[PDB]
Amino acid sequence: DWEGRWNHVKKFLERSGPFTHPDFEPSTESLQFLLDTCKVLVIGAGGLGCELLKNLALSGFRQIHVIDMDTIDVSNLNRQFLFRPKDIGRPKAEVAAEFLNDRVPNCNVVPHFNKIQDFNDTFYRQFHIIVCGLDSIIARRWINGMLISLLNYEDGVLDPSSIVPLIDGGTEGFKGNARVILPGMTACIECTLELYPPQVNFPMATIASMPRLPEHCIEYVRMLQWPKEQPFGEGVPLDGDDPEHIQWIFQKSLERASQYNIRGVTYRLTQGVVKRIIPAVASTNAVIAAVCATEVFKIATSAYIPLNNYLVFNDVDGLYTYTFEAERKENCPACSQLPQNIQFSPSAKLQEVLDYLTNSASLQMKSPAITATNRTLYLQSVTSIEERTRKELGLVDGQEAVADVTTPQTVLFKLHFT
Amino acid sequence: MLIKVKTLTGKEIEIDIEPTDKVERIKERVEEKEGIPPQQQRLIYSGKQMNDEKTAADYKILGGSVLHLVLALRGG
Amino acid sequence: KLLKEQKYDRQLRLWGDHGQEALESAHVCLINATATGTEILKNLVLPGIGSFTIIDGNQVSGEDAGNNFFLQRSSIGKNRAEAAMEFLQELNSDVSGSFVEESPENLLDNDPSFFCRFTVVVATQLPESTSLRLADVLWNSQIPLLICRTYGLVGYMRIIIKEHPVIESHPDNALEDLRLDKPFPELREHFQSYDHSHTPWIVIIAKYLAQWYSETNGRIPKTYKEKEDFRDLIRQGILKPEDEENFEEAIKNVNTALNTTQIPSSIEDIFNDDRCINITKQTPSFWILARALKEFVAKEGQGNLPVRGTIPDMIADSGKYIKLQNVYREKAKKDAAAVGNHVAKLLQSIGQAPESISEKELKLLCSNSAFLRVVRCRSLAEEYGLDTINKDEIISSMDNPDNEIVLYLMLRAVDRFHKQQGRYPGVSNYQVEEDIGKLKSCLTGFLQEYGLSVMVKDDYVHEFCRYGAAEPHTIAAFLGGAAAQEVIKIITKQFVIFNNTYIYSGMSQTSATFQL
């Protein structure tokens, strides 16, 4: 909107180039267009979110929406620059936009104090690109679905203008990863689902019978001792963020540690164990976010070739970044054009279809639900399951198909496996 | 056969593997030299991500071919 | 007071309170305050860095306020340095900001001894003339320099520290120091001292190992034929049909457990370093501890480093696991003092009082004995020297016209083109055409002055002219992120700094570290 402002962008849109993407047209109009027409949703507003918003804003984007279910907490102020202590307690999404729409002259950021799973296709169809900066997997998986259901198939053929580019960002300490997705072409989130490490899960046995680490003590005072002697009144849940709660858990983990004389219980650790905290700092987020950012700008302007669906980053030993093109599993429970033609047995029943979906390291669904042809074969989602928490009867009734699943937020879609 | 499996910090360790060793073993070889639990290793040879049930040959791994340890992250 | 811990918690879980302590006591000097410089400082101010001083002589341009998240239109015309300061200043009320309304050149002239006040100097977007000149003054003054640069979609970043030793290395995945291969008395005595699943997997392997010692005298060091059979031996110990999860665990562990003891190549190289061998009142804290270690190895270390004293978790009885833990803990504490003595003795044969080194430094140095790491950077001058230019590495890489190093050369080229022309390759929209040829004439001119027989796709020449020396924010951001961390690694002496030049490509979204 003023002299010389967007020079650091015009040069990539106004000028032609060697590595320029094919569909690239060098125009003086290109910019204004981006600024007026390009709608971009930014999921999450903390660490990545903040950084993302900044990057996008100064890259030439005006129409930006930010979604985010959380409310600012002091412990964010060490890397989520868009928040100040006075802002504590406020809606992250709100403040985020508030600040950004101010620092950057004519930006038009729209906040959404919601959790992505609040909207339905209708909503997401709006945007051209979507960038993630979520701190859970489910969420990623979920939005991954939603973005596929938008795909429109013209008799086996995918309509190009029904694909919404989904760029994802990941952080965790000094390590990070960024990827580009084109649901229905490039590998989805569900495709490279096993690239995620194994969540360290303590066998309850040791937690109650044979503790060894300070962690095992805390995890006890949390996973069991609290639910037992209702610490702060009956029914009351364990609010990980409520000091007095941690202080108690700390105190009790401190006493437990003493019983089996395991040293090493610090308040800070009691929080770690309880909140399942992930160490983080600005440094990293900056990097990853700055990458996804560029990609979006690439995708949106086509001024360069979009990254090939992957990049891993690591600061611990010097700087390192492997960049590869993950393969799209031709049987992705999610991005599979057709159903999941996969029979897991002939004679062997249907208790063998839940445990498959729930454990198979390729689906990992959480408390799923199977539908058939339209009768409900129990869904743990509360009284509609009890009427079926109950078999070779229908273990044959299914014939020999298109049993149909849908996991609690695992995916927004309805999974169809045969 | 002598392959190199670049760690997640680009260290790049060298390994002795015959085109019949299950991928699963390829990992134990890494853990032997680096102490990287096989549980949390995700190998990647030219896009394809090694399945610890197949064989080095199954993925066309030959001579001085480079494998990459990789990772996906939760936080944000 | 206790409000700070709540604030920097998520980062204290990375570099502890002590790291924070060091960080909160540093003082960074950011040379030019553009997008890159600003982003870098931002990623430091938030972490609570002690204090910073921005030295910028320029005035805020419209295009500046356009790519800087710390410069509003309202600040156009004022002093970029001052202007920027006031905004970053806001990020953290626990950081002390200062500025200098003068240029770097203007300083390297009228008062070089200035930068001696800083912990680390971070220079951003500098022309050759100034880079070389600064990387020198700072080098002599013993100041760490970090030259960062954003050009188009290329992120350039070279670090310059004569020598940087680090004790707390923080390594992702290393081999446990169980040392079953060369066990120590107490440990051995512990094993001799031996509810079946409630047994540490080590003991399990230690026992079945002790047995394999009699029926052979062997060690199971052969590898494939033995280790495997050793396992099978461990199965022949399963109780009448029950469990033995730990047993199976033991088994899986046999792939490691056997040889875990041996001095790491990297350390030997330290031990063998001149700084470690010839000591003087001059020799710094670190190196003494290094020798103090070597001496331990030679004498009571019986060939190897001190025992780490940490053991992985393992399915085991509560008190049983602990007792085992302690065995190691105690041994480690002993070897600890051992190394502690050699230290004193050394400090003595030099003058400095045996209390010149804290017990904390010692007990740490030992735990990370096997992870020590030292980094020496070639002075900037040496890399730009005609006889010294590490041209082996340049050519070695260029065996792939799409190797990030191309970009390095290109910059050198551009930089030449600048000194020569007075402006950069195609800043204005018409200079493109004209300059493309002019630029290549410099890429070559450069390549000959050093005698580098390499092929640079003409494309990279057009490209850079296209960039028009633009500082895209998403690039400056990336760079500011990676850079910021290095600055910390330096301040905290807590991790391993990358060595020599780092290069990031926006187009390919790829990077590579270089020469050394």
Ligand SMILES: Nc1ncnc2c1ncn2[C@@H]1O[C@H](COP(=O)(O)OP(=O)(O)OP(=O)(O)O)[C@@H](O)[C@H]1O
């Ligand atoms: N399923 C979800 N739907 C919408 N927003 C989400 C979802 N999950 C996380 N977010 C938001 O994503 C961001 C996660 O990044 P952030 O690093 O701040 O994590 P926390 O703040 O979740 O964790 P921490 O306590 O370690 O800071 C937050 O802004 C959070 O509210």
